[PDB]
Amino acid sequence: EYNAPSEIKYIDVVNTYDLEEEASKVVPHGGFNYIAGASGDEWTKRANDRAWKHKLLYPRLAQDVEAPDTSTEILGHKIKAPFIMAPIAAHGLAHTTKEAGTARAVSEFGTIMSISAYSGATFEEISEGLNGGPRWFQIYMAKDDQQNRDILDEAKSDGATAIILTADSTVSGNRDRDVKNKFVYPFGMPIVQRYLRGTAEGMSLNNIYGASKQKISPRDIEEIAAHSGLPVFVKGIQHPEDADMAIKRGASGIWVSNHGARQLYEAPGSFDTLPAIAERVNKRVPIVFDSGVRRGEHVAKALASGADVVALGRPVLFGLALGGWQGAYSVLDYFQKDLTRVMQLTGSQNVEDLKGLDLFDNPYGYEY
Amino acid sequence: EYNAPSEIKYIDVVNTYDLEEEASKVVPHGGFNYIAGASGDEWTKRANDRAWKHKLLYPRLAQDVEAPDTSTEILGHKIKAPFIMAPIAAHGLAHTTKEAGTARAVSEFGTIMSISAYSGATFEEISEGLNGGPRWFQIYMAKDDQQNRDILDEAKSDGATAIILTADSTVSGNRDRDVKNKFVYPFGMPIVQRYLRGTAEGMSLNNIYGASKQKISPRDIEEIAAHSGLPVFVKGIQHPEDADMAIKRGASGIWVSNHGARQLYEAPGSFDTLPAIAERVNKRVPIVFDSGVRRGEHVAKALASGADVVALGRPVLFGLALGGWQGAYSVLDYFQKDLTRVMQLTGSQNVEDLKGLDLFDNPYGYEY
Numbered sequence A, B: 001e002y003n004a005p006s007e008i009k010y011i012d013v014v015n016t017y018d019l020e021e022e023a024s025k026v027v028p029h030g031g032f033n034y035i036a037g038a039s040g041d042e043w044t045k046r047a048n049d050r051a052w053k054h055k056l057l058y059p060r061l062a063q064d065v066e067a068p069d070t071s072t073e074i075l076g077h078k079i080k081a082p083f084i085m086a087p088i089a090a091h092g093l094a095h096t097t098k099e100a101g102t103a104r105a106v107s108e109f110g111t112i113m114s115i116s117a118y119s120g121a122t123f124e125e126i127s128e129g130l131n132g133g134p135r136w137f138q139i140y141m142a143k144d145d146q147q148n149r150d151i152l153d154e155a156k157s158d159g160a161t162a163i164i165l166t167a168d169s170t171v172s173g174n175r176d177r178d179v180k181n182k183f184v185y186p187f188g189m190p191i192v193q194r195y196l197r198g199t200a201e202g203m204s205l206n207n208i209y210g211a212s213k214q215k216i217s218p219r220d221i222e223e224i225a226a227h228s229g230l231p232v233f234v235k236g237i238q239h240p241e242d243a244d245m246a247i248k249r250g251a252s253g254i255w256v257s258n259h260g261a262r263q264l265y266e267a268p269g270s271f272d273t274l275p276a277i278a279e280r281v282n283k284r285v286p287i288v289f290d291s292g293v294r295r296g297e298h299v300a301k302a303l304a305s306g307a308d309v310v311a312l313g314r315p316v317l318f319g320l321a322l323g324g325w326q327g328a329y330s331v332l333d334y335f336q337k338d339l340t341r342v343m344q345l346t347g348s349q350n351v352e353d354l355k356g357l358d359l360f361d362n363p364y365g366y367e368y
């Protein structure tokens, strides 16, 4: 019923935008539009991308810099570059090796794998791809407390070193592409099957989101943190008040995100929200930033604006479609090399120097 | 020929402003004006004080807070409240127990003592007051590198766990009170018995800042940062570019200060400089803030604006000025209790919560 790409190969990445059109040629139409699409007419996905032009980098000269070092550390994980893999459902829509292929790319590159609760691969299949590499587990909460305890226990037993509480998808965004394509998952989700009584095959993402917890409160952040004894990130924050609340409720990290514009429509581009959240967090917990990172310049601008790392999403999945783990790896390698150039030209010898950059305010925005 | 007060007692501190007028009816005019005075007509000392009215606290209701905890940690020192003692020369101008008295107050209260290179007490006298309490050593950059090696070794032998490189004093401020009083130190500086070649008493104030390094460079920051084997704070920073330079040169901390307005005249109030510096530092190293902290509200505002801790100066010395005397352990206890009240009224359970406060921008400034 669904013929995902299966080829494994490295790819020469000139830029990540060209990956979308290239992946559209190999991924079945429904699955491709599920990955690529966003809410409404995609104005907020375009805002995620255009937001990068609001704050511009300065080249700096005679900075006494050579061979920049992209390495960093988050929550006692040394990682090769200040980016991690975002939790994304259903990698089998992009490639037959699915989450095992993404996990292999992430572990081979040397950063953190985020596992979606809506993975099409089992923990065992992902663990094989990770080969001991670090992993964080993203929970889409069951309504039943005991199922959450069981899901958290499974993830920590698999070796999770943080929990990502995604709270921005209590209902689906208005994803017009998936509505027009009448898109359903063509395979099961082994980690959350328990609270879908039946199977996730042939279900819409409405009824799967529907089966998850709508009435998430701060108590949920407390209780995940107490049960897991792991640091909890709260993912989907765009308003600084939610960051303050999440920290006061026991979060160990803030994950600034609008879900790649797949949720609330006619909202700001995610990067525009970051400085106000970073100023409110004021160093209390680490910040992960995502939603629209496409270039090394974007990684640099996020760090300059208060993020400790960024999370990568669609570009990595498009690489997986085009080359399996080697194609996904190629995208991670592109971001690392792209950032190294940006570090050299900005006078940045290391990731801490990036955090110290001043940005040029562009009040004209995209058209200039 | 200097009759400092010698009485030891607790004092009922209603506010720290009243401590300045209290003291001078045995408490010598010249030394009082050395402690209290500032550059020019003291407009920038007034600016340090009025800057607190630029950013106002909001009371925050039904915040689920009681028994706030003022404890915090800096460079792995757990301290009772988020304030430390600033490095101040010549405590014997305020009281016969001099730096040993201050050290005993600081150690008994449970925070960090900063030792001025221009202490009138030997390290062994201060050590007796400290009774194993944590201490940081404040240096000036010597022209003679042997003198930099010598004082860094003295620091480490004396159990310092950080070095404070004061940079903002390569020459003296235009301190009109000391000029009009023809003020001379009435005692020696035993710690820096190695620089002044001739006599310490014979050198008034302009010759002592002259015997030290005028030509401080980043390499000075780097060299202290290398010989010390201790974290180095660079003290006197008011411009964000200096904070970025200092960190790139190996500083382990930024100490935002204008030296209590005793140095450059017709400069901003210190608190007005803090947010630009905190934004540029962007979590890379801890920030100590000083110059004008008089109230618990000031400690809260500094933390809300990016400082990890504040340093206290003149109010702790107030064993000296204008009337009948007051300043010590009672002053540290005042600041702790005052901060606890502010925490309760702002909805802050702990020092991290203070770092998340939003402040009201007052564009009308002091006269409102």
Ligand SMILES: Cc1cc2nc3c(=O)[nH]c(=O)nc-3n(C[C@H](O)[C@H](O)[C@H](O)COP(=O)(O)O)c2cc1C
Pocket: A034, A035, A036, A086, A087, A088, A089, A116, A117, A118, A138, A166, A235, A257, A258, A259, A260, A261, A262, A290, A291, A292, A293, A312, A313, A314, A315
């Ligand atoms: C196909 C797809 C599926 C996603 N599924 C999840 C999910 O299972 N869990 C989650 O927390 N976020 C999910 N997200 C959001 C991502 O974690 C991330 O926020 C987003 O991909 C970032 O935007 P970008 O990829 O355009 O840069 C998904 C995003 C995509 C594109």
Ligand SMILES: Cc1cc2nc3c(=O)[nH]c(=O)nc-3n(C[C@H](O)[C@H](O)[C@H](O)COP(=O)(O)O)c2cc1C
Pocket: B034, B035, B036, B086, B087, B088, B089, B116, B117, B118, B138, B166, B235, B257, B258, B259, B260, B261, B262, B290, B291, B292, B293, B312, B313, B314, B315
């Ligand atoms: C009497 C006096 C002497 C000082 N001596 C020194 C010094 O030896 N070393 C130094 O780094 N700063 C010195 N300072 C500056 C203090 O460390 C601190 O920045 C200042 O007291 C803070 O301002 P405030 O006390 O008005 O709040 C001195 C300040 C005063 C009032």
